[PDB]
Design a protein around this ligand. Sequence first.
Ligand SMILES: N[C@H]1CC(C(=O)N2CCn3c(nnc3C(F)(F)F)C2)=CC[C@@H]1c1cc(F)c(F)cc1F
Lengths: 726, 726
Amino acid sequence: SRKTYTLTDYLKNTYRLKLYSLRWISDHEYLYKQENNILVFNAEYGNSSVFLENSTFDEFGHSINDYSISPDGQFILLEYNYVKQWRHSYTASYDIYDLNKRQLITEERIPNNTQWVTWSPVGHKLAYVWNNDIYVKIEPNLPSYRITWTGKEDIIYNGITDWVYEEEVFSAYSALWWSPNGTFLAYAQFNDTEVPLIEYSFYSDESLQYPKTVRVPYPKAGAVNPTVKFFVVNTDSLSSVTNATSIQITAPASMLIGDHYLCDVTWATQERISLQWLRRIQNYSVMDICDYDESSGRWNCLVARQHIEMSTTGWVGRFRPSEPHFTLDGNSFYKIISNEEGYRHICYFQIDKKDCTFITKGTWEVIGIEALTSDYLYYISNEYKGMPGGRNLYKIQLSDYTKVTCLSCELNPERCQYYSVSFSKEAKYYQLRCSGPGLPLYTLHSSVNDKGLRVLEDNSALDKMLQNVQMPSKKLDFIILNETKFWYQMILPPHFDKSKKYPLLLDVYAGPCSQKADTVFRLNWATYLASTENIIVASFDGRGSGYQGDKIMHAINRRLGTFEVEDQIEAARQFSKMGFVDNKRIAIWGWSYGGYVTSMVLGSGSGVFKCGIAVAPVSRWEYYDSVYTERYMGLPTPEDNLDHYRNSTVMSRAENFKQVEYLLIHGTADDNVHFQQSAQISKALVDVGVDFQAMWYTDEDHGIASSTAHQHIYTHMSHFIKQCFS
Amino acid sequence: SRKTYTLTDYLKNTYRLKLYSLRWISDHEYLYKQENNILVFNAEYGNSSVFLENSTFDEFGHSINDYSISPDGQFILLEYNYVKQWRHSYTASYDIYDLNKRQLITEERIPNNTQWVTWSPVGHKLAYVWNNDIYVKIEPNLPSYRITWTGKEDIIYNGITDWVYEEEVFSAYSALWWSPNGTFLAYAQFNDTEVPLIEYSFYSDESLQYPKTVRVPYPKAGAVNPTVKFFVVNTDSLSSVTNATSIQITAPASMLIGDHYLCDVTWATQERISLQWLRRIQNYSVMDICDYDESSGRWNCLVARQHIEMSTTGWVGRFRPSEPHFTLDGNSFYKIISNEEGYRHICYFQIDKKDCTFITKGTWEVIGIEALTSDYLYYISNEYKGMPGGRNLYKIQLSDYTKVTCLSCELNPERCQYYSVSFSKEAKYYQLRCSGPGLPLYTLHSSVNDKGLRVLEDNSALDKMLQNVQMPSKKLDFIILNETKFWYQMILPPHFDKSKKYPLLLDVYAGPCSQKADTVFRLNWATYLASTENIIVASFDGRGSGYQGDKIMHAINRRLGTFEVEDQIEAARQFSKMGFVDNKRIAIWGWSYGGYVTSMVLGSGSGVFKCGIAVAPVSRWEYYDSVYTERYMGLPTPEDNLDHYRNSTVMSRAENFKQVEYLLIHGTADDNVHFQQSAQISKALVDVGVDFQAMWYTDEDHGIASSTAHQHIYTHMSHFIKQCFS
Ligand SMILES: N[C@H]1CC(C(=O)N2CCn3c(nnc3C(F)(F)F)C2)=CC[C@@H]1c1cc(F)c(F)cc1F
């Protein structure tokens, strides 16, 4: 009876998940924006007042993109004229509304085209970056102070990241860090002077007569990297009869010997800052811990508080060296590091001792450290049930490591096997956010005894709409390959039957530290293919996968495009023998790294796959950026790893494409995986006489995410898959 | 039973057309460039001797791309290291070989990366262009004199054209004209200082890490044009210690009041040179006739000797004003101009006499003047049988316009209705090149009494091969659209049967002066479509068509993308009324101007067409170059023709594409019709929710002519057309 989950449902978002996005302002209260207005909720009893009315900015005269209330509660920052840049960066215009005098501030305002804005963490100081320089407002209405004067477009970046650091190291545009009480402002400076430029056409609106050339400083594998410097400025000190002084913190020597990155900054106290540096050979990271010296106004990083973190089987950290969490007095800290067995667990450090003590252990991993009190450390792990694709909140007693309590495992085990958390200021309360296998569910809790205070959002409205429709189901399980287990998921059509022979789509990513087999509830394209088209959508986590230990994660070290593509092939082979797959109708698709894998798979001449789709794929590693590629690949020199760089290209496997149907898709303004990469694929297929299907997206980037390009691409891909199977 | 003409046959060139390319070297002899060696032939008796053996340069140590013999017979120029630039331009290395001494010359060689090289018309003087400057060698082994010192890559060009003059005015890279006895060298200089640059990516070999951005000075419609200068130098008066003096010929008055072009130079005598200038509004041209003055050493162009050639209905010339052919004494000349009836005919001028006397007339046109003796003018025209798509050689007695003899009409009216010609130096002999409707035939004739000396090539080998294969036929005919007759041709499958119903593919160009209905014999993609797939391939010469008078050709003046697109629709409509077309299977395809028209038709909302293919289309006129675009459109200003520039875009019709299957193909390295143009089409189609097929060809240009790309594009188009008609 009734109906399915359609393409148009997915593209028109007819079945929306409800969220409960909150913002902790104190230990006791939080804000809760809506489609209208901003409320302040008391966490204990759940009573609310209106923080400010939805109508307040009717005659503002600009579409407001986001809000930001000063930790003070005294000012609201209004973001508008939002213009997207890279994955994290953008520029916008800013106004400040003064909640005491209920008037907009009109004097000395933050200039348009501003790159980043941040409140100090306690009162209402402001720091913004505009034209690659740093400015500080001590009051919102007063003239700002110039911290920095050397900023130059595409050359010098103060307090913001360049392209590569944005994407690959900080996962943010922001490169500044206030001290806890706002006294100091730490910031990084990047220098792109020597970095070569990727150049591509941007066509813009029809009315643009000549295409423009976008040029961005982008170091491909083995090219010249940006260099970096670090500074701390005192924001109380700033008079303005002269340059307020940035004090550089350099080094350390083991890093200054050659090429290096700044990979983490984390304040420890009002007067102690930590920095992690990482070698270009992403093998070796050093953490420095630096104290403010009242007797000179300098910062001293006592070697002795230096901590060295390294790996002999791979790279350091999941994507980068993990961040420390400091005990209040700042004399000790906790960070997730790799076990002796290769499993990631929490290690406890004294700042001036080199040996840490592991406080958790076992054949599972700590995903993240979430909060720290005097008595407890709260963390997320995939321990429960030994399933690497589930997430739960635990606490551990600082007094005694033997005593660990799961806080989410038991709350609703059939609906909720994947959690994230959001603690109030001193961790007096926390909000749990369950994201599957059932419908997302949000709850409030008080830490004193972990009492569930109330349900915030249960998605009941969505629940009701979904049973007028034949939804698919999700199977999360594993298989065993030469000893080890490897998990997979499958999105099964309604009314599944293990006797019938369904067509199967292998949905792939398979990047280092990837996980495609999890318990998250998703409403996506795969949901349509299963629900309406009766295709099984499968994903497999094989060698190179994450959150299961380095033995599995580091198996592709120096060797991208080997085991992880293999295991995807083997996975399919294993999938068809399961008896409900039509081994004549097996397809495969990937975006990004997944695009690459798909391409490498469809090019292996295994005969297992009939067709496939690669969307913005990498095609050879030398085309991709230094930080990501070299992490896993080393340098493309004959001395280091050049031979494997040359053996792991898509185009070298052009001939085997004669045996499959292939669709190749790429946005023309892709700053990330440049259109170059697909341009070289097509050329090699052409040069060898292989027919294939193609589609460019003009002025689209790696996301292919504008409203119309998103619709068009999934439409086009659906047609291709249906045709390949029907 | 027995084979058809297949796609492989077309792609692998199984059925080859033999040619007979000869190169005259006197009034009496030609060279016959074999794959082996070069023979010299006596045109009277047909006997030959070896000119040089295949193994003469066996150990030159380089592949030889082309040869060129001094009018002397004493020196061969050898072209090697050929590197293509645009449609005509290239660089090469040159060596000179002494024919008498049978020796290479090793001293003072022409440099590598030479842009253009030309012998003088009588002796063995050389003029070459290297790094944008002109040099002259009186003798192959003597140092060059540098004529010019201003050359600058992309800015000043002496003796060679820039992008737009190469493609749109001169149809060559060469911009230098020796006087008849080699005494004077005349040349143009182009300045592109202010010409905006088109930029695009060139990907190159896999091994190139970062794409290069190719940039070329290219004026789009309404942009700053190159400015031009003309100079004459006496090549008998150069001193090797003193700079050569160039004498400028400026103006004229009617041109200098605005932007203008130089569109023709033709020497009249040893001391009289003719120049035609064209205003940027290509309505108005002026011929200057300039005399050397011995006393002053200058050139004087007498207003009184200048001839105006203008148009009230359109532009001047078919593409450009025609070239004059001067009488012996240089005091009169013949050139083709438009009638009072708007028909192109040969007019006889006296140099100081403003009015000319037409020497031909009627409802047909002279295509070109081929040779002028003191006695006769030999021209090609389409008079015979009133067929605009046919070509014959005529001679007209200069003392009596009554006596016009067709030299080709009657030779073989069954096989040969399309002729071109190659005269020996004083027109003592001529080769006739018949190109259809039967197989190409090449014959030699003597002018004295128009005797048919002998058959040179009759393609009998091809003939024997084609009887074992089901070949399509060809109909050439006309329909009537209110009063006027309009010609079409159809490529008809073998065993064509008017009672059956075939799918139709409209093959379109339909540019200003285009001719797609003719009698030429061709073995192409259409041959396969008809022969193997049973598809009728039709082409129609509608409004804007050439060779039928201005009433038809000027119908689209200032109005591109109207009548020519409408008539293409009318044509398909009329082919269905004929009874043998399935009107559920009508398609349209075109390259270049044909791409624009195809695209404009598909987006017309007429519903006649199920599908179509656009290869490298223009999409809006502001994107195309000034010289071609403005000739037909005027300037894109409110004061001139902006509204229609804006009304005739492909992207404003995107909505109407919901009704068609569309295929969009473009080379990424297209210098001519920029990828931009298709980039904007697909963007508009995505914005409106229309699914369609696309294909880019990396590093391919407007020709998409490299061996592998050619095979790939036609394979891809074939599948698409097969899918549409299945
Ligand atoms: N440029 C890379 C950035 C990146 C990263 O550093 N991430 C994100 C994913 N990520 C991170 N931390 N934690 C988590 C998550 F939890 F999601 F696993 C940081 C991951 C993969 C990105 C990538 C790789 C690739 F091969 C492409 F072709 C394209 C592309 F965007």
